[PDB]
Design a protein around this nucleic acid. Sequence first.
DNA 1: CGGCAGTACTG
DNA 2: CAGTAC
DNA 3: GCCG
Length: 319
Amino acid sequence: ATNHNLHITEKLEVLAKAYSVQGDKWRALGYAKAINALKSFHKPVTSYQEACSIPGIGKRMAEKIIEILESGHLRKLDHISESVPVLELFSNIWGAGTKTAQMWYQQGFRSLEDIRSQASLTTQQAIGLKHYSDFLERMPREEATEIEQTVQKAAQAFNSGLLCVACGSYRRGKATCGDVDVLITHPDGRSHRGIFSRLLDSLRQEGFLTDDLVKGETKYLGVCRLPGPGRRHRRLDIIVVPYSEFACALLYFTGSAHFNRSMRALAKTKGMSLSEHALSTAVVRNCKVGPGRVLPTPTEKDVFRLLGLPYREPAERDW
DNA sequence: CGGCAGTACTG
DNA sequence: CAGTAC
DNA sequence: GCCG
Ligand code: NA
């Protein structure tokens, strides 16, 4: 359960991160998968041929693994553009991605203070910038509990039947959480409809929601802060789903993102697709001309079973 | 080589 | 539509 | 980046 390849994964991560901020999204993904594969390997990798037998690791990656193995270093790291750390700075701003980080850099911006004054910001980015440090800190698991509970108590005041579950890294049992995701549904047919808009206004007037980032029909991305002195602003999502979708949503929003991805790819090998909504039979084509059949999945286990896969609890889904 | 998810909001 | 994030 |  321990990473026997740490000195190697560290160097790789620096390189992946650089590709990521530069917007080389797919090469960065390739790196991420190789890195997870290395973290879970039963022992320190000791040969180029052993590295190649690992799924997610190919010639080029093995090459870099062995260089670090035998050198201690990765020459490539020495040739990353000086731009990278500023690109990373700017793209740590919620709502700012690689294109915006890049644009700002091309304009000569170099610090958050520059961005704050001299730069043009979307409404989302401004909320991101002003909560920049708060949003970078992981919060104690117990603060995730308070936040989730604040939502649940305000939710159940409208309909005591509503189920609220905190997902993401919280559900996966982490001691600290980067954000909170509160999934809400109702066991009955569908008493989840109608109360969303009212819950948010309640939480807002109450003082809990400080800023809105995205107001969707059934998904809310925003910012909360618990009552009291010295509280930090925390990133918060609320999703409302019909009961039929509870299992898939629970799975998706629990993630992790890497796990979700691997689950989609498996589903694909079995002629299926997996989304936050459903495990479904393949779609009708030409192109793309109709939905697949939805496969009933009351529980997460159902989803794993239908993919011919043993159930893995939330704590075992880092990837 | 192409796919690596599909969508949902904001502007 | 481009960009961003779930 | 990797994989079929
Ligand atoms: Na960001």
